[PDB]
Amino acid sequence: GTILLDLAPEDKEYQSVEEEMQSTIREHRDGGNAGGIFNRYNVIRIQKVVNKKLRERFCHRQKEVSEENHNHHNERMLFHGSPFINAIIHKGFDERHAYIGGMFGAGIYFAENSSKSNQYVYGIGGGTGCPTHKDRSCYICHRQMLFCRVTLGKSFLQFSTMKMAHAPPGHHSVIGRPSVNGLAYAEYVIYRGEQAYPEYLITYQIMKPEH
Ligand SMILES: O=C(CCSc1nc2ccccc2c(=O)[nH]1)N[C@H]1CC[C@H](c2nnc(-c3ccccc3)o2)CC1
Ligand SMILES: [Zn+2]
């Protein structure tokens, strides 16, 4: 099964991960309603998810994809946030838990910006916030997000992704690109759980802006 390996802060691997997270905090047009109001995170833990079988599934799919993508599996490190993280780190991603509805198709979404994924830690639009205080901007409760290896293969670009069940023929992923009457940032979508490996499990808190 899965083994979570704690990384130490002096480890350069820890420092890269936290830097990518801290440096990708972006401005969201919702006044912080979904993910809360914060300028930085308090990263309190970064664990490496080690799962032999899960890795083998990932690499096997990566091979299939590469052969259909002129030998480029096109892997990318991206963020993912959702209430399913504990289940994911133990069994791997599962597209069976992805449904068409609202602004999303039946795929698993990833973001280049940590702050975007933070908006989904407690559910779509931040849900009702943390379980304990029902505060989307809770500075107390610990949140978790994943920094994963994502096999994109041949990506199909489009503006809306809310009605997708699978990637278009010949493709392995879909990228929702920004538009004036639509998305603010790009969203990476896969429709097969095995196209993502939850490399790092980040435990953190958003920090209140300093006075
Ligand atoms: O990606 C999304 C959209 C909203 S969440 C979201 N939306 C975004 C949109 C744009 C940019 C970033 C994000 C983001 O980070 N999260 N839903 C996903 C969330 C995780 C689900 C799932 N995957 N594996 C499982 C599983 C469950 C039980 C046992 C084992 C595995 O569940 C599938 C649907
Ligand atoms: Zn709370």
Provide the resolution (angstroms): 1.8
Of 92, 17, 88, 97, the closest CA to residue 59 belongs to: 92
Q: How many CA atoms lie within 13 A of 59 on its CB side?
A: 6
Cα of 173 vs centre of ligand 1, distance in Å, is 15
Instruction: Name, in order, each residue with C-beta under 8 angstroms of 210's C-beta and a sequence gap of 6 or more.
Output: 39
CA pair distance 156, 7, nearest whole angstrom: 36
Query: Which residue ranges have their beta carbon within 6 Å of ligand 1?
Result: 79-82, 84, 87-88, 91, 93-94, 97-98, 104, 108-111, 116-117, 120, 124, 187, 193
In order of start, what are the domains of the chain with their CATH numbers?
1-211 (3.90.228.10)
Q: How was this structure determined?
A: X-ray
Mutate to test the pocket of ligand 1, among 2, 77, 90, 108 (most ligand atoms within 8 A of CB): 108
Query: 112 and 193 in contact (C-beta within 8 Å)?
Result: no
Q: Point out the ligand nearest to the CA of residue 129.
A: 2
Reduced to 3 states, what is the DSSP secondary structure of residue 202? Answer: strand
Q: Which two tokens stand for residue 177?
A: 């690109």
Instruction: Name, in order, each residue with C-beta under 8 angstroms of 21's C-beta and a sequence gap of 6 or more.
Output: 41, 43, 79, 114, 145, 147, 202, 204
Q: Which two tokens stand for residue 15?
A: 């420092």
